[PDB]
């Protein structure tokens, strides 16, 4: 009645659920924020002080 297959199916269903939810999440920070990816130990980014 309960097997790892059922747990994996529920995991995939939840994955799809909240992936769809997040993909449609409202965006408001991008209006007044700048997105900057980082890879490791990122603490300094010297584009500031330049106009």
């Amino acid at each position: 009645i309960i097997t790892p297959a059922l747990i994996s199916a529920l995991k995939t269903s939840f994955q799809k659920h909240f992936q769809d939810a997040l993909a449609t999440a409202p965006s408001t920070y991008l209006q007044v924020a700048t997105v900057i990816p980082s890879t490791t130990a990122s603490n300094t980014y010297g584009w500031l002080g330049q106009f």
Binding site: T34, I36, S38, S42, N43, T44, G46, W47
Partner: protein, 50 residues
């Protein structure tokens, strides 16, 4: 210029010996990197900047 009517005469273009002297100019800009974030591998910056 406009189509002119014959009166037994000829009319050549009017305006001549004049100019405007636009005097084109030049513009530039520059940006920096600070040489620090390269070590940190924070190369995400400078994409949206450019």
């Amino acid at each position: 210029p406009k189509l002119r009517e014959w009166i037994g005469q000829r009319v050549i273009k009017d305006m001549a010996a004049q100019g405007y002297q636009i005097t084109n100019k030049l513009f530039e800009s520059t940006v920096g990197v600070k040489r620090t974030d390269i070590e940190d591998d924070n190369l995400g910056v400078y994409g949206p900047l450019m």
